[PDB]
Amino acid sequence: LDAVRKRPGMYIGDTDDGTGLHHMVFEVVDNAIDEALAGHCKEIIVTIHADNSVSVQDDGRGIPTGIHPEEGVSAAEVIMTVLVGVSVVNALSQKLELVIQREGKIHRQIYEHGVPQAPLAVTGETEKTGTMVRFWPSLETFTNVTEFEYEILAKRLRELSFLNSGVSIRLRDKRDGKEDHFHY
Numbered sequence: 542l543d544a545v546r547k548r549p550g551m552y553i554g555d556t557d558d559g560t561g562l563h564h565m566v567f568e569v570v571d572n573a574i575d576e577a578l579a580g581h582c583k584e585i586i587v588t589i590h591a592d593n594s595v596s597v598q599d600d601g602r603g604i605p606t607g608i609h610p611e612e613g614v615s616a617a618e619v620i621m622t623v624l625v626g627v628s629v630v631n632a633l634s635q636k637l638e639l640v641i642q643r644e645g646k647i648h649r650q651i652y653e654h655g656v657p658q659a660p661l662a663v664t665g666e667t668e669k670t671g672t673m674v675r676f677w678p679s680l681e682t683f684t685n686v687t688e689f690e691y692e693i694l695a696k697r698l699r700e701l702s703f704l705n706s707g708v709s710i711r712l713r714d715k716r717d718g719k720e721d722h723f724h725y
């Protein structure tokens with residue numbers, strides 16, 4: 542991921558005017574919509590947390606967790622660490638936490654600046670399926686505009702709900718309680 546770290550704006554967009562900051566969310570949402578479309582209930586939830594991290598979750602099948610035969614690490618870690626996709630978001634997040642519910646197990650992993658802190662690990666049992674990512678944009682990269690703007694996210698999620706009919710998209714702001722539900 543060092544090519545991304547060297548020139549973040551070439552991958553995510555302008556890192557000073559808020560463009561790249563909000564594109565971080567959109568790249569994660571792209572992956573969440575993919576996952577939601579492959580499951581039964583087809584809902585994603587985008588949450589702006591009070592510490593200006595964002596989480597994105599889906600109720601799909603779960604990102605695959607088995608060891609990648611050539612890379613020698615979990616498939617999830619391959620997606621997160623091989624190069625626009627969520628690997629760029631990971632590289633530019635001072636922290637990124639993920640949870641995958643799949644085949645009866647809960648799997649968790651934490652990254653800092655794209656670096657895995659331990660291998661993907663089973664932490665418990667579950668009867669649910671789906672994926673969640675919460676990320677803290679790196680304040681070493683994103684300057685000036687560092688806080689998420691609710692309406693910038695809402696405008697894009699609204700567009701996506703028309704294009705991805707039948708996918709339910711909820712947006713929640715824990716800073717001021719504002720919420721929306723886009724479903725076409």
Ligand SMILES: Oc1ccc(Oc2ccccc2)cc1
Nearest residue numbers: 572573597598599620672674
């Ligand atoms: O709801 C989501 C959020 C992020 C997603 O992308 C991922 C990529 C690799 C591992 C985990 C997640 C997939 C689904």
Ligand SMILES: Nc1nc2ccccc2[nH]1
Nearest residue numbers: 546635653654655656681
């Ligand atoms: N603070 C900080 N910034 C980093 C960038 C790349 C890898 C590790 C890092 N720790």
